[PDB]
Structure formats: structure tokens, C-alpha cells
Amino acid sequence: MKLEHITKKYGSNVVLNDIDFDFGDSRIVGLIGKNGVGKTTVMKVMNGNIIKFDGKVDIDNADNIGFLIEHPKLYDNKSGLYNLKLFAQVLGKGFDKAYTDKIIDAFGMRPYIKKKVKKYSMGMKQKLAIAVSLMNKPKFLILDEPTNGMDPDGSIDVLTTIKSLVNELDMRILISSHKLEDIELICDRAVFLRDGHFVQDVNMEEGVASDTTIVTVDHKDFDRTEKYLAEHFQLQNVDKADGHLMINAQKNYQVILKALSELDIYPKYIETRKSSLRDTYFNINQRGDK
Amino acid sequence: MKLEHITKKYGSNVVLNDIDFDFGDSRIVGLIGKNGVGKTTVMKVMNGNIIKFDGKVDIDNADNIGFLIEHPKLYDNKSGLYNLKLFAQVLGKGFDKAYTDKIIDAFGMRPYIKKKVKKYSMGMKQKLAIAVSLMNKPKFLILDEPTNGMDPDGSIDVLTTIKSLVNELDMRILISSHKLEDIELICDRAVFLRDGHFVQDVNMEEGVASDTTIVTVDHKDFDRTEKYLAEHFQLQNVDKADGHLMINAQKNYQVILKALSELDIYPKYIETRKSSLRDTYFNINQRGDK
Amino acid sequence: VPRGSHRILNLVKYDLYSIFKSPLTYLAILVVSSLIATQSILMANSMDNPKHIIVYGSVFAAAKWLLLIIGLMFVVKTITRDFSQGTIQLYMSKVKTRVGYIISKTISIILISILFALIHYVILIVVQASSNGKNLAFSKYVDNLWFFLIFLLFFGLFLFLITLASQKTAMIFSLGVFLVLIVPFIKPFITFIPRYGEKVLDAFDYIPFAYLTDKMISSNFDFSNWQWVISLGSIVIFFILNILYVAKKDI
Amino acid sequence: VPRGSHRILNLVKYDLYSIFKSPLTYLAILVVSSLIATQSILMANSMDNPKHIIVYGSVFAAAKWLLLIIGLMFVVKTITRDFSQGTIQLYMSKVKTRVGYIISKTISIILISILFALIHYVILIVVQASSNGKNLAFSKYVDNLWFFLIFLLFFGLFLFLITLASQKTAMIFSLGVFLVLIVPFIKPFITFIPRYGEKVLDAFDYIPFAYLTDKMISSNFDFSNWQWVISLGSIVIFFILNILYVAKKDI
């Protein structure tokens, strides 16, 4: 799935302009931008719902692409389960009962899966639609605001489920979405599209030098805490006057807290401050309107 | 706008059950709940799109009610501006040019207001739809996930604009919405709906923040950590699914960390931060699935 | 109060406004004009090698047929527009509005019928200006208006009720067309076959679908007292039903 | 590869499956059966006080008419279902699939036509079992299948192309009905009027819309060599156009 020099306009309105895209051995790529920038357009070009993009869309047609664009697409007078079976048989390879069940129960749609779609709420339709896309057991999954109508728990479980699946199946996932907080849960990179061209890429697995975990201890504990962190981590900064030590950001404090406990040291305060995709977004786009 | 003993079922599925509702001199009431609870249903009853609710809906019909339910409703082959004029003349009192302009530019939809709706993105349609509802210069505004498809800035500006308007016009606003963070921006109360009835009435007059501290533990340590913290501090809320325990904020983590270490418990995480509707939500609803 | 009436009329104005802007309307008018001119020019003035004298009555009936069909489709679009775009949900919020919605559409149907009758009049006046023959009575054109109003309002309200009953639009356009083109098809195909053939044929005079459709190609009309009453009574009951129904149907 | 063919067929199976589950299908069948039984019972065996002997050919033609119309509507629904539910967007993602979509629908149209022909056969066999008269040739029923296949496939693919061209469904159902009921209406209304009347009438033998619609009420048929070729050629070109178009149209 590669995009080379894609250009797309609607009359005089250029949406995409010489835009390139790939997956640099990444698996989960988020797509961020303001409304009117063209995220859906990019996805449609990749899906192949557009054939007037003046550029090269490199797709090994041997592979399957699953997707969800804008509002969910379902057959209203049929059950949820019906739709899953149909699409698995029709767009997918066949209907895999075990696979289907894992998705249904993981999403928690089970209680209404046998009810007709027209009786579904917007949220329910989206949970189903995501599952419909997944039923193709695709390699490329393209989702246009997949959690747009989901509740807090729905979003977490669905996104978590997909991440598990990208290893079960050799997948590559493109997620265009607001709720940067959801992208931050499941991502390994994100791209920011503004003014019809990619502007800033972010490598989630690299982060920045400033992403540090700060340990604060009593003055009498400082030297022995510094010894411990020097021997097991990289000290980026040392403020003995105030009792602070800075190391690269830690996701899980258990190793540090257990080791300090063996030394009879208990830190008063541990904090990590790393910039959010939200902050990145505003820095880039806020000036359009503001 | 009062609801007394409203009961509504679809066949055997009871959605609302003896549910009462009012505005206790409040202006902005948020509505929170899981998908499938019935938020839209409540709003439809209030709007009057349902006449089979077995109960009393107290509406002075002298007043206007503006609303947006589920996906936006617009005439696709007409311009955005056309729709605003039409609805103002048709459902509203008349077309108020100055009013209309304030909304258009405040929302920032100006650059595409003269384009046909079918050429609009999902986000654009929602910005317009909100404006369409507002054009009735209503007293009661009922919005079903009004910022569902909006970008970070769109959401803030739209919500801010509405809050300004509730004073310009003597309004009462009901907002059903995910993105608790948006409700927290514009609210003075929120109600939590579960199993057909209200469970909490959460009043918020000021940004008091009620600072809290989150302590996160392995699931195998949850029960004993809960017991320790509830006995020695004030437990505010929990999130069992994610292993969080929320207590009244502590300046200094030493006492808690030492006491937990004596119980062989070492937190995965700890942090002092502001209170949220998100935490309230999970405390109430997480057990459905988890 | 007049405020209510005003809002109802504003909706009517928009539906008519739309008719006068869409290029499709203009196309349909040109098609009718062309077809009428074609009949006049090709044979009315030449088939029997007359000294360019024609029967306006033949033209009149043909024009009526075409305009009633186009008109009915305009009526159906007027009816189904809100179901199609889903905008109906923004109207049916309370009884006063729900009722006003029906009223507005009823008014629009009447105005559409008037427009089509005016077109009919104009097309024929041009034909009369163009060639020789005894001009048709003004009063004949007037009666033709009455036919249009009744025909279209009857079908319009009937279809409206169905539209609201089913909340589908595809089948409204289908019924409009179907009903119009079925009566003249089926009559001569099998009416004469059963022992009840005469009974059935006579029965059609008391069935608005049959007699209103049949008169679409007549050069004139004269409704019997029963036939007149039955048609008008049917219009009234449909109007009533539309109100009673809209007041109760969840949207 | 067979994998491609399999996916195409799976879509076909679902469309046919739907036909056999909806109660509407069953209703339509019962209506046809009732109407045929009614004609047989009411007058075929009694009008001239015969010794209960009937003309199966009259029944045959009537049954055909009804089933072709119902059939065409089934075809239109099959065609428009994905536009209606918007599900078409989930299919047209690449050329192989886009083409397969057309292929699948073409197959479904053929199978629908076969189903309707089978119904026709059965209804008439029951009539033959029920009363007296010389049974119709098996080969007559077979030719009737050919008529069904051609009639429905021609209209189906034509309407399909329109459906894809406009991406509207209301007007597809409308055209299906309109075209069927207009030919038999208009012929005797004005064909004889122009100096070109005979020319026009003869011309209809070379226009599939006219001759295929007219033969819907015939007890038999025999296509001229030209007429046969023209119809089949029309089917082939529509099929081709559907492919060329779907391959390029943005969804």
C-alpha cells in the first residue's frame, strides 16, 4: 500500500497535492488533521473508491483491504449477525465462526447481534461496522473515525482488539481520527496532514529527549538514589539542591520503586511529562482559525 | 420542559422506566451513559418525535425547541446557507441575518457556506446542523452528540458559542454526549443514565477540581490496595477494569508508598490531577462489561 | 394565530421556489411544448390536406395528459422530498407543527396543480394563435383547471398518506406512474371478458381511480352528480386521515 | 481464479436467498395464483356455457403479463438494493471487484427470470390439471422461458446502467413501470394519427422497448430474424457498457 504523488481536486479545490505515503515497517499509523483537510479522501484513494487521483496507487491486488468510510454501511432490515455472515462470504474469504465470535464478544455486541440493524443505535452500528470490515480478514485496514460514536469503554475494547489482531493477521492499519487520546492508545506513529500536504511526522517509538520521568527524594537519600539510577538508567539531569533526578520516561515504575525500596528509599513524588498528540495538533493547526 | 414518569419500551425491551427529569434552575445539563442506555430516546421524547411514551411530557407549546438527533438532516442539493435560511423561515420565527452571521463565523464555516451540502464533509455537516438548530432561536436546545464528528478546535468554538448564546437568549440546553471532556467545558450539571433511570445527579457550579490522586496496581493487588486505601484515606472512586483507585489528593506519596510496600504492593502508576466526569462514568458503568 | 399560518406558508413557498429553479422543470416544459407543436405542425395541418385548419380539442386532450403526468410526478416529489432527505424528522416534533406540515403540503399540491393548468392554458393559446380553427371556450379551459385540481389533489393526498404510512419514497413514484398507466391498459384488455364485464365497467364510474384516470385523455368532461361527489368526498377523507395519522406516527 | 468466481456467486446467492425469505414474495405469488384461478373459474368455464372447456392460451398470456411485471420489479430491487442501503460503497473498491459486482448482478437477473418462468409454468400446469382443454405444448412453455429471459435481462441491464449512471433508486422503479405500461397505452392512442403512422408502427418492430413490451400480452411469439438479433445485441451492449462504466465511476 503505497501512495506516490497523489493529487486530487474537486474543480478548483485542491485537496491532495503531490502527497506521498507509506508504512515504514510500522503497523499502526494514525492520521490527524482538521476537518476539511482530506483524511477521508486519502482513504478513499487507498481503498480504491476514487479513480481520478492523478498519481500512482501501489496495491498488490492479491491482498484484501477492509474499510469503513463516513457513516456505517449495513443492510437495515437484516440482523447484525446476518451482515457479518454476508460480508465474510461476499467480500471476505468465507465465514469464520470462531473469528467472528471473538470479535463479537470482544466488542460486547453479543446481546443485540441477532436483532435487526434498523433497531440499532448509532453506536451499535459502528461497533458492527468495524467488525464487518474485520471480517474480510484483510491485511490493510482503513478506518475513518472508527470510534466516532463509541462510548469510553467501547472505544478502548475495540481498539485493543484490533491491536491484538494485527499480530494474529499480518496487518497494517490506517486510522483517521479525532480523539487523539484514542490514537495514543493504539499507534506507533502518526502523520499530520494540513494544507493538502503531509507537514509533520511523529515516530511514537522514539519520542523526544525531553520525555523524562522525574524522581524526587529526601536530601539524605539523594546520593544513594543517584547511584541507583546512574547504575541502571541514564541520568539526563541531577538537581541535588531540590532533590530531583531525571531519567528517560518510564511506562512502569515497579522496577524503580522495588529497587529503591530494597535500599529503604521511598520517593515523595514521581512524574512524567511528555507532549500529547493533542498538543502537537494544535501547534500545527491552531493558526488556521486563530 | 419536564418529564414525569416516562416509560418507553420496544416490545420487551424497556429503555426508559419511570424516569423523571428537570432543570433545577440550571442551564447546561449534560447527559452521560453507555451506548444502548437510551440517551437519544429521552431526547426524542422531549423533542416530541415519540408519542408512545406512557407518561407526561410537560412542554409549554408556546416555546420553541431546536434539536439535532443522530446524523445531521440537511437538504443535500442545496447550499449550507440555503438550509439556514430555510429553516429560520420555516421552523424558526424568520431569518435573522446578523444572528446567522455570528454563528457562521463563530463556527468558522464561512468558506464553504455557499457550497452544496452534498459536497460537505461529515464534520462540516455537523457544524451546519448545529447552526440549523440554533437558527430557530429556541429556548430549549437538545443536542445528540453535537461534537461527535468535530475536530478539537471546532468542538471548543462551537460549545463556547452556545454557552454565550444561552445568556443572549433565555435558553436551557440538554447535551447528550461522549467526550466527557467537552461536557466538562460547558456544563453546570450532568446526569448519569443507566438501566432506564437516572443514577447520579452531578452538580458542578465552579471549577473546584476536587483534586484527586490516582494509585494504579496490578489486578492481583487490587482488592488489598482498595482495602488499604479506603481504610486510611478517603476513597472517591475506583476503576476495577484498569486497576485504578482514586483517593483525596496527597501532596506527598511517601506514607502511601511505604505502607503499600509493607503489604508487598508496588504501584504500576501514581499521579495527582483534577477530578473528572470520565472517572465518575467508569465508576458507574464499567461493571456492565467488566 | 397568523404566526402559525405564516410558518406553514413559508414551507409552501420553498417547495414552489424549488420547482421554479430546477432545470428539470424547464426541460419538462420544453418537452411538452415540443410534442404539442409537433402534432400541430406534422399532421393536424396536413393529414387530410386541409387548408391548415386544426382541432384544438385533440391538442388540448394530449396536452392535458402530458401535464397531468408531469404534474403528478412534481406532486410526488413535493411529497417525498422530506422522507428522501430525512428532513421530516425536523418537522414532526409536536402536534401543531405535524398538522401544519400536512396543511403546507396540501397547499403546495394545490398550487402545483394550478401551475400545471396554467401551463396547459398557455400551450394551447399558443397553438390557437399559430393556426386556424375555432378557438376553445375560455370556460372550457376553466373546467380543465377544475379537472387538474381534483385529479392531482386526489392522487396527491392518497399517495401522501401512503408515503407517511410506509415512510418509503421509491414506491410512491412507482404508484403514481402505475396507477395512471394501468387503468387505460386494463380496461380493453380484460373488462369485456367476464360475465360481470358490464357490471365492472359500470362500476368504474364510481371508482375515482378509474374514472379520474380515464378522463385524463378526454377533450372534455362532465362529472355525474355521484361521480363528482365521490371524488370530492375522497379528497376530504384523505385530508382528514393524513391529519389523524401524522398526529400519532412516531418519527 | 475460482476464488474470484466463488465470491461473485456468494453475492448472487444472497440476493436470491432474500427473495425466497421475504413475505412479500409469497404474497405476490398468491396474488397471481388467485387472479389466474379467478379467470378460469369465473368465466373461462362459464361465459358461453361451454361444457367446462377453456383456452389455456388466454390464461397463459395473462399469467405472463403479471409475472413479467412482478419479475421486473424483483429485478429492479435486486439492482437498487445496494444503492438504497448505501452498501455499494463496500463493493466498489477495485476493478476486479467492480467487475465482479456487475457479473453477480447479471447472474442474479438471469436466475430471477428463470424463477418467474418456473412460477408461470406451475400456475398454468395447475390450470391444465384443473379443467378441460387441449394442454399446451411443453415447447411452448419453453419458448415462454426464452421470452422471460430476454425481456427481463434487457430491461434489467438497461435499468442497471441507469442506476449506476444516476445513483438514484426511485427513478429506476419508476422507469421499470413506466416503460412497461406506456407502450400499449400510446400505440392505439396516437400511432395512427400522423402521416408517418404506418412508418412509426413498422419502426416499432425494430425497437426492443416497443416490441418486447407489446409481446408481454401475447399468447405466443415468433421473433423475426432482425427482431431477435436486435434484442440480443442490445443485451450484449448493455452488459459491456455496465462493465466499462463501473470500472471508471467514483463511489
Ligand SMILES: Nc1ncnc2c1ncn2[C@@H]1O[C@H](COP(=O)(O)OP(=O)(O)OP(O)(O)=S)[C@@H](O)[C@H]1O
Ligand atoms: N463529493 C464532493 N464534492 C466536492 N467536494 C468534496 C466532496 N467530498 C469532499 N469534498 C471536499 O474535499 C475536502 C476534504 O474532504 P474529506 O476527505 O471528506 O475531509 P476529511 O479530511 O475526511 O474531514 P472530516 O470529514 O471532517 S474527518 C473538503 O473541503 C470537502 O468539501
Ligand SMILES: Nc1ncnc2c1ncn2[C@@H]1O[C@H](COP(=O)(O)OP(=O)(O)OP(O)(O)=S)[C@@H](O)[C@H]1O
Ligand atoms: N427503532 C428502534 N427499534 C427497536 N429498538 C430500538 C429502536 N431505536 C432504539 N432502540 C433501542 O433502544 C435502546 C436505546 O436506544 P438509543 O436511544 O438510540 O440509545 P442512546 O442512549 O442514544 O445510545 P447512543 O446511540 O449509542 S448515544 C437500544 O437498546 C436500541 O437497540
Ligand SMILES: [Mg+2]
Ligand atoms: Mg471525513
Ligand SMILES: [Mg+2]
Ligand atoms: Mg444515539
